[PDB]
Amino acid sequence: AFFPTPSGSIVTSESQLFNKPYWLQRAQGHNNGICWGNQLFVTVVDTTRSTN
Amino acid sequence: KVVSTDEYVSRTSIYYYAGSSRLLAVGNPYFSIKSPNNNKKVLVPKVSGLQYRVFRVRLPDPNKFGFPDTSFYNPDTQRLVWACVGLEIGRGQPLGVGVSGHPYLNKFDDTETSNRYPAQPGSDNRECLSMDYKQTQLCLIGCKPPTGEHWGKGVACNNNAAATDCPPLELFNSIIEDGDMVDTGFGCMDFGTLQANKSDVPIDICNSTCKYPDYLKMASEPYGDSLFFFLRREQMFVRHFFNRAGKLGEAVPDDLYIKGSGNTAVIQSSAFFPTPSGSIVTSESQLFNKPYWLQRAQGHNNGICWGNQLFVTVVDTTRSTNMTLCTEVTKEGTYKNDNFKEYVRHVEEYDLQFVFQLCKITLTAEIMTYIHTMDSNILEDWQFGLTPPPSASLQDTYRFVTSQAITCQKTAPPKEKEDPLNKYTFWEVNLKEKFSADLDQFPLGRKFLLQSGL
Amino acid sequence: DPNKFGFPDTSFYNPDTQRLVWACVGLEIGRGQPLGVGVSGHPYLNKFDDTET
Amino acid sequence: SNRYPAQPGSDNRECLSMDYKQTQLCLIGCKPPTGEHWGKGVACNNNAAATD
């Protein structure tokens, strides 16, 4: 019964995903950004700002 | 109500280059060495590739210039100010990263392949080790020196609680003076107060306050006089895994692990820490020896440098090589160990070029309000809105100053106290007597004319 | 030297009040070997101990 | 790690193996292609060659 270990790699600012603009001219679904109920739901997951 | 900076100045049709000399900087990359007999007598200053190199130019005043053509400038109402349009950071050293490391590092074990029970106790297990740092390259420009936060101490509060004993935490934004340390992957925090063992971090950091550029606060500044234009590029990854050596106060809760016995009756540490290291450092992803034609700033100040001065900050670890000196004491014919005294030195090389464009400001009375609510100090250096000083006649006149009609005469007030920024050690560069008007005699004005589309 | 060239045509070149010079416009570096890194080493290098782990 | 006194021995040959470089090339010709290699030749047998 075996299991390996995950180990990560290097992390650059060149291939980041934050502090950059976004414009939603056309979404994928049918709601084009119309937020019902006067609320939003944003979720973000990072692991690269996680010093101890 | 704020406004942008393209509606009350005007670009002229004249351009100026100025350029510094080649900067020299040498020292020891581990500690400053003072006198044994005195504290303030430095011998070799501590400079490495890990210091926030902060230069501050002093561009000469425009209104002290006398032109043969006095047509474009009105001295009755208009004034001048300088603007930055082109800029250069020069580097002249071979590429290579240096190593640092504390000789008494708080490494208990290594925790990556095998740590066999039982633990190895003993009240002293610090040892010597060394490692690479997180490589970093970035640059900032502005007319106000850049701000920086850090993590620090503080009061928790009053003793209503009787829960535990753990230190508090609080951020503090400060002014980034020169000589301060760059982060390398161990928290933007002061190790001089938050740590007590002084035996976990290499020696360059342990009595420092390593800070980090707050991009968020500077962008959220109203006038925007602290971020003209900036880049950054950095990377890191892991090297090993170690663990601390001490009683972990915040112990592991009981339900989340099955207790052992016999050889497995004691619990080891649960505080781990990795060691960072840079990757390959190419010459392709360099950030300097390249022109920067500023077109439009992200703030509102579009290059107008109030106060006739600029601030450049730059950090680089890719030229952090370490020269190892080796001299002897007694000449032998056979090898010895006590016959050599060694030293370690680190060099540093910089250069700066600048392209300036002067600008006139029509001064009507509604605009100088907007200058006044910017800050009051700009308007007085132009000597524009002042008061007539009253108080005509005095009689403090005596023919003989050392006599017996004494009034105990005292003079020399401290009235030339004007600079609030004098509490921070910058790197001054004298640029007042280094101008010229012929751009085509320089290795950057030739690059300027090809970019201008003339 | 360019001035030692007796040209068959003289109608483009006055030797009394002109001279000639050369200039590079083409440039090439030729290699002819397999690729490989060399290694050297001191037989008495000043290594005291290890300091990695 | 070569912390050392001298080491004796008559033969110290061992069993080793390693890979080589990956290398892709192709070429088309009218004449069959010509290459080169280094090799031994004349020695000119003169001037006190104390090195073989």
Side-chain angles (χ1 to χ4, degrees):
Chain A
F2 316 123
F3 73 105
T5 177
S7 186
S9 89
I10 78 183
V11 46
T12 184
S13 44
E14 184 156 9
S15 86
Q16 269 310 305
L17 262 185
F18 301 115
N19 318 319
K20 66 185 289 185
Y22 293 114
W23 322 104
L24 306 185
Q25 308 185 13
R26 201 208 152 276
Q28 54 90 15
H30 289 281
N31 189 293
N32 204 356
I34 307 194
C35 42
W36 312 117
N38 321 115
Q39 41 183 352
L40 260 58
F41 268 105
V42 64
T43 67
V44 53
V45 160
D46 189 357
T47 178
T48 52
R49 266 63 172 260
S50 43
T51 174
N52 297 116
Chain B
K1 168 72 172 311
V2 78
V3 82
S4 65
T5 49
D6 300 356
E7 290 82 51
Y8 57 92
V9 298
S10 298
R11 314 299 191 94
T12 66
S13 160
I14 195 69
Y15 290 99
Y16 280 156
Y17 153 78
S20 56
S21 159
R22 169 171 67 176
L23 186 62
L24 76 162
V26 74
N28 174 73
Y30 283 139
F31 43 86
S32 49
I33 298 185
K34 288 97 188 169
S35 156
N37 294 319
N38 199 7
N39 198 289
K40 61 169 189 293
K41 284 215 293 175
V42 291
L43 294 174
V44 276
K46 194 203 70 172
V47 60
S48 68
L50 309 162
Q51 314 212 298
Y52 267 56
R53 301 281 94 203
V54 186
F55 316 126
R56 168 204 174 201
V57 313
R58 190 163 298 116
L59 205 170
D61 161 82
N63 301 267
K64 269 188 181 227
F65 264 60
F67 302 92
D69 183 286
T70 329
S71 63
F72 53 89
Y73 170 65
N74 190 3
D76 292 331
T77 47
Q78 310 169 341
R79 285 300 191 270
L80 286 86
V81 72
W82 291 96
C84 165
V85 73
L87 185 151
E88 191 70 8
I89 297 99
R91 291 305 275 272
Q93 270 308 106
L95 278 305
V97 64
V99 188
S100 298
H102 179 33
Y104 269 90
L105 200 163
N106 206 324
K107 176 249 288 188
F108 191 58
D109 306 321
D110 42 352
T111 172
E112 64 287 342
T113 71
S114 44
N115 189 38
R116 196 166 302 274
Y117 278 165
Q120 188 55 50
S123 190
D124 187 84
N125 283 316
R126 325 179 283 176
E127 80 171 53
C128 49
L129 214 57
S130 281
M131 73 304 289
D132 186 18
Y133 283 164
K134 174 248 293 182
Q135 65 94 34
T136 303
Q137 275 177 0
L138 70 95
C139 58
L140 272 295
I141 48 169
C143 52
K144 190 69 64 67
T147 67
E149 79 284 340
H150 95 287
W151 287 110
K153 275 292 295 293
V155 65
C157 32
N158 74 99
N159 310 350
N160 47 4
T164 175
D165 188 19
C166 280
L169 288 174
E170 192 38 70
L171 53 95
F172 303 98
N173 46 359
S174 68
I175 283 182
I176 308 180
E177 83 167 8
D178 197 278
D180 305 343
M181 277 312 94
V182 62
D183 265 34
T184 175
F186 290 97
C188 176
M189 64 101 75
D190 181 275
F191 291 86
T193 77
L194 274 301
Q195 295 323 286
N197 49 350
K198 63 183 50 57
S199 297
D200 48 356
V201 187
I203 324 110
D204 46 344
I205 311 300
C206 50
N207 268 327
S208 89
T209 316
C210 55
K211 296 157 195 195
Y212 189 80
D214 202 307
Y215 307 95
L216 281 305
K217 185 170 172 55
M218 293 200 227
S220 159
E221 210 276 337
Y223 283 119
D225 50 12
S226 299
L227 167 56
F228 277 142
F229 151 76
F230 81 113
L231 275 301
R232 53 167 157 171
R233 199 198 161 272
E234 77 291 338
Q235 72 212 20
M236 58 146 289
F237 76 114
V238 312
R239 175 61 59 106
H240 293 321
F241 310 94
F242 308 106
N243 44 359
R244 293 272 181 252
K247 286 187 276 172
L248 286 72
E250 211 90 350
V252 184
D254 293 330
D255 54 353
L256 302 193
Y257 75 107
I258 286 179
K259 216 164 68 63
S261 47
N263 193 30
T264 66
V266 296
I267 304 103
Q268 276 196 6
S269 158
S270 315
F272 327 113
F273 70 107
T275 176
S277 181
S279 92
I280 58 173
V281 281
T282 173
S283 53
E284 189 264 355
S285 69
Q286 286 291 99
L287 272 296
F288 320 110
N289 311 327
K290 296 196 307 152
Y292 282 141
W293 318 106
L294 176 59
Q295 280 212 358
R296 207 195 149 278
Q298 327 283 349
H300 279 263
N301 192 340
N302 208 25
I304 294 96
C305 40
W306 314 98
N308 319 109
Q309 52 185 10
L310 279 304
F311 294 91
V312 297
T313 58
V314 53
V315 293
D316 166 50
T317 71
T318 65
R319 279 164 191 86
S320 87
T321 75
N322 296 138
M323 286 214 168
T324 80
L325 280 196
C326 167
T327 183
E328 50 92 22
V329 280
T330 50
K331 179 58 183 311
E332 287 294 321
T334 312
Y335 194 75
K336 284 296 191 186
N337 281 329
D338 204 18
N339 217 17
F340 296 103
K341 289 210 180 182
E342 56 266 24
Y343 311 108
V344 55
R345 285 302 215 272
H346 166 77
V347 301
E348 184 39 73
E349 180 173 358
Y350 286 130
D351 189 12
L352 292 83
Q353 282 73 239
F354 291 95
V355 193
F356 291 129
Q357 170 183 33
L358 56 93
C359 280
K360 63 184 175 188
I361 309 104
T362 301
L363 205 157
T364 182
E366 46 269 62
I367 313 184
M368 48 89 74
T369 76
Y370 194 96
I371 285 97
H372 210 178
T373 180
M374 181 72 76
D375 197 294
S376 287
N377 55 354
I378 306 100
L379 212 164
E380 52 90 17
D381 295 309
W382 290 353
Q383 297 75 41
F384 204 87
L386 274 301
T387 58
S391 65
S393 64
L394 58 91
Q395 294 177 335
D396 297 332
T397 76
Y398 300 98
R399 211 65 186 259
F400 307 101
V401 294
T402 64
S403 67
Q404 312 311 307
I406 180 174
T407 59
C408 295
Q409 275 77 3
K410 186 261 180 182
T411 58
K415 296 179 179 179
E416 295 177 350
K417 174 58 206 61
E418 285 98 27
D419 48 352
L421 279 76
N422 216 9
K423 276 86 68 184
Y424 313 100
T425 43
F426 282 76
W427 209 341
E428 296 289 329
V429 282
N430 189 210
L431 272 301
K432 313 185 320 294
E433 278 280 341
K434 272 188 180 185
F435 267 57
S436 291
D438 263 347
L439 281 78
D440 293 333
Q441 272 60 235
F442 286 110
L444 200 145
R446 308 195 295 273
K447 276 174 181 166
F448 180 74
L449 266 297
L450 278 189
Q451 193 268 333
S452 52
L454 188 145
Chain C
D1 186 287
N3 311 323
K4 328 290 179 70
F5 275 168
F7 267 62
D9 192 0
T10 79
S11 282
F12 70 99
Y13 165 68
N14 172 39
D16 184 309
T17 43
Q18 298 160 332
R19 283 302 175 264
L20 311 95
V21 300
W22 296 102
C24 275
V25 78
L27 193 43
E28 204 268 324
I29 302 299
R31 290 317 284 269
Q33 289 297 110
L35 279 301
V37 178
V39 177
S40 64
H42 209 305
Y44 284 94
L45 173 147
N46 188 26
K47 187 263 193 184
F48 185 42
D49 307 315
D50 196 295
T51 172
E52 167 62 354
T53 67
Chain D
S1 44
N2 215 335
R3 299 185 33 87
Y4 83 103
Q7 179 149 1
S10 193
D11 47 356
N12 302 122
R13 325 188 299 202
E14 284 207 11
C15 275
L16 269 185
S17 309
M18 73 296 299
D19 67 53
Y20 314 104
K21 59 182 181 292
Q22 44 198 279
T23 295
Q24 296 187 30
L25 62 93
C26 64
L27 65 154
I28 309 106
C30 181
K31 192 67 65 67
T34 167
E36 72 266 48
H37 80 297
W38 296 109
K40 209 168 57 180
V42 308
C44 316
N45 53 89
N46 53 3
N47 215 27
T51 285
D52 288 333

Coordinates of all heavy atoms in Angstrom, one line a residue, chain B residues 316-364:
Chain B
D316 N 18.2 44.4 -6.0 CA 18.6 43.4 -6.9 C 19.5 42.4 -6.1 O 20.4 42.8 -5.4 CB 19.4 43.9 -8.1 CG 20.1 42.7 -8.8 OD1 19.5 41.7 -9.1 OD2 21.3 42.9 -9.1
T317 N 19.2 41.1 -6.2 CA 20.0 40.1 -5.6 C 20.9 39.4 -6.7 O 21.7 38.5 -6.2 CB 19.2 39.1 -4.9 OG1 18.5 38.3 -5.9 CG2 18.1 39.8 -4.1
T318 N 20.8 39.6 -8.0 CA 21.5 38.9 -9.0 C 22.9 39.4 -9.1 O 23.7 38.7 -9.8 CB 20.8 38.9 -10.3 OG1 20.8 40.3 -10.8 CG2 19.3 38.5 -10.1
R319 N 23.3 40.5 -8.5 CA 24.7 40.9 -8.5 C 25.2 40.9 -7.1 O 25.8 41.9 -6.6 CB 24.8 42.3 -9.1 CG 24.9 42.2 -10.6 CD 24.6 43.6 -11.3 NE 24.4 43.5 -12.7 CZ 23.2 43.3 -13.2 NH1 22.2 43.1 -12.5 NH2 23.1 43.2 -14.6
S320 N 24.9 39.9 -6.3 CA 25.2 39.8 -4.9 C 26.4 38.9 -4.6 O 26.4 38.2 -3.6 CB 24.0 39.4 -4.1 OG 24.0 38.0 -4.0
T321 N 27.4 38.9 -5.5 CA 28.6 38.1 -5.3 C 29.4 38.5 -4.1 O 29.2 39.6 -3.6 CB 29.5 38.1 -6.5 OG1 30.2 39.3 -6.6 CG2 28.6 38.0 -7.8
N322 N 30.2 37.6 -3.6 CA 30.9 37.8 -2.3 C 32.4 37.5 -2.6 O 32.8 36.3 -2.7 CB 30.3 37.0 -1.2 CG 28.9 37.3 -0.9 OD1 28.1 36.5 -0.7 ND2 28.6 38.6 -0.9
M323 N 33.2 38.5 -2.5 CA 34.6 38.4 -2.7 C 35.2 37.9 -1.3 O 34.9 38.4 -0.3 CB 35.3 39.7 -3.0 CG 35.0 40.1 -4.5 SD 36.4 40.9 -5.2 CE 35.9 40.9 -6.9
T324 N 36.0 36.8 -1.4 CA 36.7 36.2 -0.3 C 38.1 36.5 -0.3 O 38.9 36.1 -1.2 CB 36.5 34.7 -0.3 OG1 37.4 34.1 -1.2 CG2 35.1 34.4 -0.8
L325 N 38.6 37.3 0.7 CA 39.9 37.8 0.8 C 40.8 36.8 1.6 O 40.3 36.1 2.5 CB 40.0 39.1 1.5 CG 39.7 40.4 0.6 CD1 40.2 41.6 1.3 CD2 40.3 40.2 -0.8
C326 N 42.0 36.7 1.2 CA 42.9 35.7 1.9 C 44.3 36.3 1.9 O 45.0 36.3 0.9 CB 43.0 34.4 1.2 SG 44.3 33.3 1.7
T327 N 44.8 36.8 3.1 CA 46.1 37.2 3.3 C 46.8 36.3 4.4 O 46.1 35.6 5.1 CB 46.2 38.7 3.7 OG1 47.6 39.1 3.8 CG2 45.5 38.9 5.0
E328 N 48.1 36.4 4.4 CA 48.8 35.6 5.4 C 49.5 36.5 6.4 O 49.3 37.7 6.4 CB 49.9 34.7 4.6 CG 50.7 35.5 3.7 CD 52.0 36.0 4.3 OE1 52.4 35.5 5.3 OE2 52.6 37.0 3.8
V329 N 50.2 35.9 7.3 CA 51.0 36.6 8.4 C 52.4 36.3 8.4 O 53.3 37.2 8.4 CB 50.3 36.3 9.8 CG1 49.1 37.2 9.9 CG2 49.9 34.9 9.9
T330 N 52.8 35.0 8.2 CA 54.2 34.6 8.2 C 54.4 33.7 7.0 O 53.6 32.7 6.8 CB 54.6 33.8 9.5 OG1 53.7 32.8 9.8 CG2 54.7 34.8 10.6
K331 N 55.4 33.9 6.2 CA 55.7 33.2 5.0 C 56.3 31.8 5.4 O 57.3 31.8 6.1 CB 56.7 33.9 4.1 CG 57.0 33.2 2.8 CD 55.8 32.9 2.0 CE 56.1 32.0 0.8 NZ 57.2 32.7 0.0
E332 N 55.8 30.7 4.9 CA 56.3 29.4 5.1 C 56.6 28.7 3.8 O 56.3 29.3 2.7 CB 55.2 28.6 5.9 CG 55.2 29.0 7.4 CD 56.4 28.7 8.1 OE1 57.0 27.6 7.9 OE2 56.8 29.5 8.9
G333 N 57.1 27.5 3.9 CA 57.3 26.7 2.7 C 56.4 25.5 2.7 O 56.3 24.7 1.7
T334 N 55.7 25.3 3.8 CA 54.8 24.2 4.0 C 53.5 24.8 4.6 O 53.5 25.8 5.3 CB 55.4 23.1 4.9 OG1 56.7 22.8 4.5 CG2 54.6 21.8 4.9
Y335 N 52.3 24.1 4.3 CA 51.0 24.6 4.6 C 50.7 24.6 6.1 O 51.2 23.7 6.8 CB 50.0 23.8 3.9 CG 48.6 24.4 3.8 CD1 48.4 25.5 3.0 CD2 47.6 24.0 4.6 CE1 47.1 26.1 3.0 CE2 46.3 24.6 4.6 CZ 46.1 25.6 3.8 OH 44.9 26.2 3.8
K336 N 49.9 25.6 6.5 CA 49.5 25.7 7.9 C 48.0 26.1 7.9 O 47.5 26.5 6.9 CB 50.4 26.7 8.7 CG 51.8 26.2 9.0 CD 51.7 25.1 10.0 CE 53.1 24.8 10.6 NZ 53.2 23.6 11.4
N337 N 47.4 25.9 9.1 CA 46.0 26.5 9.2 C 46.0 27.9 9.9 O 45.2 28.7 9.6 CB 45.1 25.6 10.0 CG 44.5 24.5 9.1 OD1 44.4 24.7 7.9 ND2 44.2 23.4 9.7
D338 N 46.9 28.1 10.9 CA 46.9 29.4 11.6 C 47.7 30.4 10.9 O 48.0 31.5 11.5 CB 47.4 29.1 13.1 CG 46.9 30.2 14.0 OD1 45.9 30.9 13.7 OD2 47.5 30.3 15.1
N339 N 48.1 30.2 9.7 CA 49.0 31.1 9.0 C 48.2 32.0 8.0 O 48.8 32.6 7.1 CB 50.1 30.4 8.3 CG 51.4 31.2 8.3 OD1 51.6 32.1 9.1 ND2 52.3 30.8 7.5
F340 N 46.9 32.0 8.0 CA 46.1 32.8 7.1 C 44.9 33.5 7.8 O 44.2 32.9 8.5 CB 45.6 32.0 6.0 CG 46.6 31.4 5.1 CD1 47.0 30.0 5.2 CD2 47.3 32.2 4.2 CE1 48.0 29.5 4.5 CE2 48.3 31.6 3.4 CZ 48.7 30.3 3.5
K341 N 44.8 34.8 7.5 CA 43.7 35.6 8.0 C 42.9 36.0 6.8 O 43.4 36.5 5.8 CB 44.2 36.9 8.7 CG 44.9 36.6 10.1 CD 44.7 37.8 11.0 CE 45.3 37.6 12.3 NZ 45.1 38.7 13.3
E342 N 41.6 35.7 6.9 CA 40.7 35.9 5.8 C 39.7 37.0 6.1 O 39.3 37.3 7.2 CB 39.9 34.6 5.5 CG 39.2 34.0 6.7 CD 39.9 33.0 7.5 OE1 41.2 33.0 7.4 OE2 39.3 32.2 8.2
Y343 N 39.2 37.6 5.0 CA 38.2 38.6 5.0 C 37.1 38.4 4.0 O 37.4 37.7 3.0 CB 38.8 40.0 4.8 CG 40.0 40.3 5.7 CD1 41.3 40.4 5.1 CD2 39.9 40.5 7.1 CE1 42.4 40.6 5.9 CE2 41.0 40.8 7.8 CZ 42.2 40.8 7.3 OH 43.3 41.1 8.0
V344 N 35.9 38.9 4.1 CA 34.9 38.8 3.1 C 34.4 40.2 2.8 O 34.1 41.0 3.7 CB 33.8 37.8 3.6 CG1 33.2 38.3 5.0 CG2 32.6 37.7 2.6
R345 N 34.3 40.4 1.5 CA 33.9 41.7 1.0 C 32.9 41.6 -0.1 O 32.8 40.5 -0.8 CB 35.1 42.5 0.5 CG 35.9 43.1 1.6 CD 35.1 44.0 2.5 NE 35.9 45.1 3.0 CZ 36.7 45.0 4.1 NH1 36.7 43.9 4.8 NH2 37.4 46.1 4.5
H346 N 32.1 42.6 -0.4 CA 31.0 42.6 -1.4 C 31.0 44.0 -2.1 O 31.1 45.0 -1.4 CB 29.7 42.3 -0.8 CG 28.5 42.7 -1.7 ND1 28.2 41.9 -2.8 CD2 27.7 43.7 -1.7 CE1 27.2 42.4 -3.4 NE2 26.8 43.5 -2.8
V347 N 30.9 44.0 -3.4 CA 31.0 45.3 -4.1 C 29.6 45.6 -4.6 O 28.7 44.8 -4.6 CB 32.0 45.2 -5.3 CG1 33.4 44.9 -4.7 CG2 31.6 44.1 -6.3
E348 N 29.5 46.8 -5.2 CA 28.2 47.3 -5.7 C 28.4 48.5 -6.6 O 29.2 49.4 -6.4 CB 27.3 47.8 -4.5 CG 25.9 48.3 -4.9 CD 25.3 47.4 -5.9 OE1 24.9 46.3 -5.6 OE2 25.2 47.9 -7.1
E349 N 27.7 48.4 -7.7 CA 27.9 49.4 -8.8 C 26.6 49.9 -9.4 O 25.7 49.0 -9.7 CB 28.7 48.7 -9.9 CG 29.1 49.5 -11.1 CD 30.0 48.8 -12.1 OE1 30.4 47.7 -11.7 OE2 30.4 49.4 -13.1
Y350 N 26.4 51.2 -9.5 CA 25.2 51.8 -10.0 C 25.5 52.9 -11.0 O 26.6 53.5 -11.0 CB 24.3 52.2 -8.9 CG 23.7 51.2 -8.1 CD1 23.8 51.1 -6.7 CD2 22.9 50.2 -8.7 CE1 23.1 50.1 -6.0 CE2 22.3 49.2 -8.0 CZ 22.4 49.1 -6.6 OH 21.8 48.1 -5.9
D351 N 24.4 53.3 -11.8 CA 24.5 54.4 -12.6 C 23.1 54.9 -13.0 O 22.2 54.1 -13.0 CB 25.2 54.1 -13.9 CG 25.5 55.3 -14.8 OD1 25.4 56.5 -14.3 OD2 25.9 55.1 -16.0
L352 N 22.9 56.2 -13.2 CA 21.6 56.8 -13.4 C 21.7 57.8 -14.5 O 22.6 58.6 -14.6 CB 21.1 57.5 -12.1 CG 20.8 56.7 -10.9 CD1 21.9 56.3 -10.0 CD2 19.7 57.4 -10.0
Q353 N 20.7 57.8 -15.4 CA 20.5 58.7 -16.4 C 19.0 59.2 -16.4 O 18.1 58.5 -16.0 CB 20.8 58.2 -17.8 CG 22.3 58.1 -18.2 CD 23.0 57.0 -17.5 OE1 23.9 57.2 -16.7 NE2 22.5 55.8 -17.7
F354 N 18.8 60.5 -16.8 CA 17.5 61.1 -16.7 C 17.3 62.0 -17.9 O 18.2 62.7 -18.4 CB 17.4 61.9 -15.4 CG 17.4 61.1 -14.2 CD1 18.6 60.8 -13.5 CD2 16.2 60.6 -13.7 CE1 18.6 60.0 -12.3 CE2 16.2 59.8 -12.5 CZ 17.4 59.6 -11.9
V355 N 16.0 62.1 -18.3 CA 15.5 63.0 -19.4 C 14.5 63.9 -18.8 O 13.5 63.4 -18.2 CB 15.0 62.2 -20.6 CG1 14.8 63.1 -21.7 CG2 15.8 61.1 -21.0
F356 N 14.7 65.2 -18.9 CA 13.8 66.1 -18.2 C 13.2 67.0 -19.3 O 13.7 67.3 -20.3 CB 14.5 66.9 -17.2 CG 14.9 66.1 -16.0 CD1 16.2 66.0 -15.5 CD2 13.9 65.3 -15.4 CE1 16.5 65.3 -14.4 CE2 14.2 64.5 -14.3 CZ 15.5 64.5 -13.8
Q357 N 12.0 67.5 -18.9 CA 11.2 68.4 -19.8 C 10.6 69.5 -18.9 O 9.7 69.2 -18.1 CB 10.1 67.6 -20.6 CG 9.1 68.5 -21.3 CD 8.0 67.8 -22.0 OE1 7.6 66.7 -21.5 NE2 7.6 68.3 -23.1
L358 N 11.0 70.7 -19.1 CA 10.5 71.8 -18.3 C 9.1 72.2 -18.7 O 8.8 72.0 -19.9 CB 11.5 73.0 -18.3 CG 11.9 73.6 -19.6 CD1 11.0 74.8 -20.0 CD2 13.4 74.0 -19.6
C359 N 8.4 72.9 -17.8 CA 7.0 73.2 -18.0 C 6.6 74.5 -17.3 O 7.0 74.7 -16.2 CB 6.1 72.0 -17.5 SG 6.0 70.6 -18.7
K360 N 5.9 75.3 -18.0 CA 5.4 76.5 -17.4 C 4.0 76.3 -16.9 O 3.2 75.4 -17.3 CB 5.4 77.7 -18.5 CG 4.4 77.5 -19.6 CD 4.6 78.6 -20.6 CE 3.7 78.3 -21.9 NZ 4.0 79.3 -22.9
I361 N 3.7 77.1 -15.9 CA 2.4 77.1 -15.2 C 1.8 78.5 -15.2 O 2.4 79.4 -14.5 CB 2.5 76.5 -13.8 CG1 3.2 75.2 -13.7 CG2 1.1 76.3 -13.2 CD1 4.6 75.4 -13.2
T362 N 0.7 78.7 -15.9 CA 0.0 80.0 -15.7 C -0.7 80.0 -14.4 O -1.5 79.1 -14.1 CB -1.0 80.1 -16.9 OG1 -0.4 80.0 -18.1 CG2 -1.8 81.4 -16.7
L363 N -0.4 81.0 -13.6 CA -0.8 81.1 -12.2 C -1.9 82.1 -12.1 O -1.6 83.3 -11.9 CB 0.4 81.4 -11.3 CG 0.3 81.0 -9.8 CD1 1.7 80.9 -9.3 CD2 -0.5 81.9 -8.9
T364 N -3.2 81.7 -12.2 CA -4.3 82.5 -11.8 C -4.7 82.1 -10.4 O -4.3 81.0 -9.9 CB -5.4 82.5 -12.9 OG1 -6.5 83.3 -12.5 CG2 -5.9 81.1 -13.0

